[PDB]
Design an enzyme around this catalytic site. Structure first.
Site, PDB file in Angstrom:
ATOM      1  N   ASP A  60      48.319  47.563  22.474  1.00 17.57           N
ATOM      2  CA  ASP A  60      48.059  47.271  21.063  1.00 17.57           C
ATOM      3  C   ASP A  60      48.979  46.216  20.447  1.00 17.57           C
ATOM      4  O   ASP A  60      48.657  45.655  19.399  1.00 17.57           O
ATOM      5  CB  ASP A  60      48.123  48.547  20.219  1.00 17.57           C
ATOM      6  CG  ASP A  60      47.121  49.591  20.670  1.00 17.57           C
ATOM      7  OD1 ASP A  60      46.157  49.240  21.380  1.00 17.57           O
ATOM      8  OD2 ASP A  60      47.293  50.774  20.311  1.00 17.57           O
ATOM      9  N   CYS A 163      55.775  32.587  37.222  1.00 16.76           N
ATOM     10  CA  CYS A 163      55.190  32.190  35.949  1.00 16.76           C
ATOM     11  C   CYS A 163      55.556  30.820  35.415  1.00 16.76           C
ATOM     12  O   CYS A 163      54.875  30.306  34.533  1.00 16.76           O
ATOM     13  CB  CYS A 163      55.487  33.240  34.883  1.00 16.76           C
ATOM     14  SG  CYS A 163      54.544  34.755  35.099  1.00 16.76           S
ATOM     15  N   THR A 196      49.744  42.287  42.047  1.00 16.29           N
ATOM     16  CA  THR A 196      50.625  43.097  41.189  1.00 16.29           C
ATOM     17  C   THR A 196      50.135  44.450  40.647  1.00 16.29           C
ATOM     18  O   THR A 196      50.931  45.207  40.097  1.00 16.29           O
ATOM     19  CB  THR A 196      51.077  42.294  39.944  1.00 16.29           C
ATOM     20  OG1 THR A 196      49.923  41.872  39.215  1.00 16.29           O
ATOM     21  CG2 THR A 196      51.880  41.083  40.339  1.00 16.29           C
ATOM     22  N   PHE A 214      49.209  41.092  32.555  1.00 10.67           N
ATOM     23  CA  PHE A 214      48.666  40.235  33.600  1.00 10.67           C
ATOM     24  C   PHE A 214      47.147  40.176  33.788  1.00 10.67           C
ATOM     25  O   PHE A 214      46.459  41.206  33.944  1.00 10.67           O
ATOM     26  CB  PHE A 214      49.337  40.559  34.947  1.00 10.67           C
ATOM     27  CG  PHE A 214      50.864  40.515  34.917  1.00 10.67           C
ATOM     28  CD1 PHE A 214      51.550  39.842  33.904  1.00 10.67           C
ATOM     29  CD2 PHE A 214      51.605  41.138  35.917  1.00 10.67           C
ATOM     30  CE1 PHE A 214      52.975  39.789  33.890  1.00 10.67           C
ATOM     31  CE2 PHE A 214      53.025  41.094  35.922  1.00 10.67           C
ATOM     32  CZ  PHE A 214      53.709  40.422  34.908  1.00 10.67           C
ATOM     33  N   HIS A 302      54.388  28.856  27.833  1.00 13.76           N
ATOM     34  CA  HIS A 302      53.866  29.928  28.674  1.00 13.76           C
ATOM     35  C   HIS A 302      53.944  31.245  27.886  1.00 13.76           C
ATOM     36  O   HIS A 302      55.030  31.701  27.528  1.00 13.76           O
ATOM     37  CB  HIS A 302      54.690  30.069  29.964  1.00 13.76           C
ATOM     38  CG  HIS A 302      54.294  31.254  30.787  1.00 13.76           C
ATOM     39  ND1 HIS A 302      53.050  31.369  31.368  1.00 13.76           N
ATOM     40  CD2 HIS A 302      54.938  32.418  31.044  1.00 13.76           C
ATOM     41  CE1 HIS A 302      52.944  32.555  31.943  1.00 13.76           C
ATOM     42  NE2 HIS A 302      54.077  33.211  31.758  1.00 13.76           N
ATOM     43  N   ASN A 335      48.183  37.065  30.279  1.00 15.64           N
ATOM     44  CA  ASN A 335      49.139  36.280  31.067  1.00 15.64           C
ATOM     45  C   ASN A 335      48.595  36.068  32.479  1.00 15.64           C
ATOM     46  O   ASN A 335      48.592  36.999  33.304  1.00 15.64           O
ATOM     47  CB  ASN A 335      50.484  37.021  31.145  1.00 15.64           C
ATOM     48  CG  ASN A 335      51.574  36.213  31.834  1.00 15.64           C
ATOM     49  OD1 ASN A 335      51.309  35.217  32.519  1.00 15.64           O
ATOM     50  ND2 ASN A 335      52.821  36.649  31.655  1.00 15.64           N
TER      51      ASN A 335
HETATM   52  O1  LIG Z   1      47.032  36.902  38.027  1.00 18.21           O
HETATM   53  C1  LIG Z   1      48.357  37.141  37.927  1.00 18.21           C
HETATM   54  C2  LIG Z   1      49.030  37.130  36.667  1.00 18.21           C
HETATM   55  C3  LIG Z   1      50.422  37.374  36.588  1.00 18.21           C
HETATM   56  C4  LIG Z   1      51.187  37.654  37.776  1.00 18.21           C
HETATM   57  C5  LIG Z   1      52.627  37.902  37.642  1.00 18.21           C
HETATM   58  C6  LIG Z   1      53.473  38.168  38.665  1.00 18.21           C
HETATM   59  C7  LIG Z   1      54.912  38.410  38.553  1.00 18.21           C
HETATM   60  C8  LIG Z   1      55.648  38.680  39.748  1.00 18.21           C
HETATM   61  C9  LIG Z   1      57.041  38.931  39.727  1.00 18.21           C
HETATM   62  O2  LIG Z   1      57.713  39.185  40.870  1.00 18.21           O
HETATM   63  C10 LIG Z   1      57.703  38.916  38.467  1.00 18.21           C
HETATM   64  C11 LIG Z   1      57.009  38.645  37.252  1.00 18.21           C
HETATM   65  O3  LIG Z   1      57.644  38.630  36.044  1.00 18.21           O
HETATM   66  C12 LIG Z   1      55.619  38.399  37.317  1.00 18.21           C
HETATM   67  C13 LIG Z   1      50.501  37.663  39.030  1.00 18.21           C
HETATM   68  C14 LIG Z   1      49.117  37.417  39.094  1.00 18.21           C
END
Ligand SMILES: Oc1ccc(/C=C/c2cc(O)cc(O)c2)cc1
Ligand SMILES: Oc1ccc(/C=C/c2cc(O)cc(O)c2)cc1
EC number: 2.3.1.74
Lengths: 388, 388
Positions: A60, A163, A196, A214, A302, A335
């Site tokens: 939220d 990122c 992830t 993500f 970003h 993200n």
């Molecule tokens: O589609 C995606 C979107 C975001 C991510 C992020 C991955 C990530 C991996 C890490 O080790 C640390 C972090 O802060 C972020 C992976 C795939």
């Protein structure tokens, strides 16, 4: 034939210019408002009632309305180990990444090549970036195969950077295009959360926030120096680039590629680190141009999370509208790691045109693009808009 | 201030030049003649006496006298799963790589910097290559911390590219150096077999030959355009680079990073495939220079295996001397993946200076560097020597 003559006739003359931009996302659209119910059910944590409420608050306040995910109920139902919090699951995730990364990547590249309008055979370099790559050859090889580009396209795969890599690929593309006459660099960032995704833990509430932020997506660009008028259409010009590590930030954002997949660590102090260190980055970038007012340039940052944007905004006393394009992408896609800043460039040039403004850069002349990631690393790219 | 103005003052002037080279290897030296006994024992295969015979055969035809290995008998003893052919061992392996890849890499970098003579504070870019990297940040970040490089050094990690990456890091350094005035690039390839070591299986002999060939090592370079007269000493200049994929070679060389660590596979015809495409890579590189006699240039070839060197030599009818520096590295170090071609450059300039020759390239003016790996990919780097 000295090295002198060759060198001179081998390099390009003008600045690296973005000539086209295309994006793609898996088809499955997941609404943020009701993601918690979905997530806790699919990860068999519907009993962790107390923790769910915690996830709902995170979503939220994430300032994200929806995200796109390759992972579907059906796929997840087929891979229970990926649904557990910390179970051996790498091999399963690698199989998913081997296919989706290049597929989503190609889709964006095709849109980009189509906007560019030139023969794909004219592509001379290829940069492919993803949080991870499953095998050898890396995903750059698989993308070239899918796209049918010339076997001799010079390839560079950018993996496990993170990122901030959206800035990294632009920094890489700038030198490849500027130092080589006729070079046309296809740049592709493709991030898929199969790497992830994992269950919730009422002990790693820090990692739990990654699951609310993500999303998946791929963004592609064509970069080149010495644009051919009547044939190519400049969008943005790259002027200068930098990369730096913030002091006192070791461990703020890191990850470990292990048997249970990619584990990630986020520190709540990340927004403060970015805010405390942003002025420095700007001064180095804009003082040489004699720019002091940071509201006179267009912005692309970003969207690691909403707090980073809010605190940067306050820090520099930016007009509320500076971050609109960045928040628009965060809102509709979440993200997507490296791809975020590329979706933002596209949104920005699109909105600027749709609405008949002066330049592709919201009418402004100079602009900046920021990438933030493991390090904590900050990538800076100074850009110049194009007259519409 | 215009972008056009910034560009002109921002770029370097001359060809990217290699200013220093330094190498390093783990202390544990393993002789090739007695490796089969040591190997089949530490991997509890003492009983499969027959396969132990097939390996001894492979080690004898290898043309390698010894290798340096981080993995010691003791370590393997503490890690039983790494000694199996395919048991969950990735997590153990990552811990080893996390420490050794950067440690060995810093060791080679320090030697390079010393030869160079300038403060490491003058290093502006860092390229770090390794077959894999365990976490995020990638090893480039770790090397930056360990060497105490400035926090604004621009990094680029080259992971999961493979054996041809020695060519790849050269291709990258060339553009970064040539396109940025004052740029000084520290290039580091560090490879440790803890990622590939595994017990034997008579069902995957292609995986077994990896065990007879792969060794550990790290090599570092300093690359920059416009060397400062009588402060910096050029060793070789880079002139032109290319990367291509050989026809119908997909599957010849590949690997999968899985729960059991990194596998390796072959289609055993790799040697023919390299031989068959080499002339075309050579033509493309040298026709532009009127050079057609490949015995008139100096040679640096990635020693993936002895047979590749033999076939290239056969097919091009090269004098036995051409492949000498290359075979000498394979002899004292085995196949260190990306690092090999850099060890060879060091060996060539050393021997040339030792035999009182006229150039760092065995007394010749032009030369070629070849990297080969997953793809199958072929990296080409055209070099020019420096008068000694
Ligand atoms: O589609 C995606 C979107 C975001 C991510 C992020 C991955 C990530 C991996 C890490 O080790 C640390 C972090 O802060 C972020 C992976 C795939
Ligand atoms: O120290 C080291 C030296 C070399 C290597 C090579 C590994 C390797 C793995 C693959 O899947 C394909 C390949 O072409 C090479 C690993 C460690």
């Amino acid at each position: 034939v000295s090295v002198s003559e060759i060198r001179k006739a081998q390099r390009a003359e003008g600045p690296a210019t973005i000539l086209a931009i295309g994006t793609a996302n898996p088809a499955n659209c997941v609404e943020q408002s009701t993601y918690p119910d979905f997530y806790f059910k699919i990860t068999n944590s519907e009993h962790k009632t107390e923790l769910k409420e915690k996830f709902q608050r995170m979503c939220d306040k994430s300032m994200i309305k929806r995200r796109y995910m390759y992972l579907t109920e059906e796929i997840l139902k087929e891979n229970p180990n990926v649904c557990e919090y910390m179970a051996p699951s790498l091999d399963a995730r690698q199989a998913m990444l081997a296919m989706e990364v290049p597929r989503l990547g190609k889709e964006a590249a095709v849109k980009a090549i189509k906007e560019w309008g030139q023969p794909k055979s004219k592509i001379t370099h290829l940069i492919v970036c993803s949080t991870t790559t499953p095998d050898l050859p890396g995903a750059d090889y698989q993308l070239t195969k899918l796209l049918g580009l010339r076997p001799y396209v010079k390839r560079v795969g950018v993996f496990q950077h993170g990122c901030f890599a959206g800035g990294t690929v632009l920094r890489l593309a700038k030198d490849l295009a500027e130092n080589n006459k006729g070079a046309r660099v296809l740049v592709v960032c493709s991030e898929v959360t199969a790497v992830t995704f994992r269950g919730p833990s009422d002990t790693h509430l820090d990692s739990l926030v990654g699951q609310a932020l993500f999303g998946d997506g791929a963004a592609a660009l064509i970069v080149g120096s010495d644009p051919v008028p009547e044939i190519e259409k400049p969008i943005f010009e790259m002027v200068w680039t930098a990369q730096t590590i913030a002091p006192d930030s070791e461990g703020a954002i890191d990850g470990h590629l292990r048997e249970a997949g990619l584990t990630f660590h986020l520190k709540g102090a990340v927004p403060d680190i970015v805010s405390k260190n942003i002025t420095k980055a700007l001064v180095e970038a804009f003082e040489p141009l004699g720019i002091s007012d940071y509201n006179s340039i267009f912005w692309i940052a970003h969207p690691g999370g909403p707090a980073i944007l809010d605190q940067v905004e306050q820090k520099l006393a930016l007009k509320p509208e500076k971050m609109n394009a960045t928040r628009e992408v965060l809102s509709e896609y979440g993200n997507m790691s490296s791809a975020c800043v590329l979706f933002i460039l596209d949104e920005m040039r699109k909105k600027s045109t749709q609405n008949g403004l002066k330049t592709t850069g919201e009418g402004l002349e100079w602009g900046v693009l920021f990438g933030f990631g493991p390090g904590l690393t900050i990538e800076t790219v100074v850009l110049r808009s194009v007259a519409i």
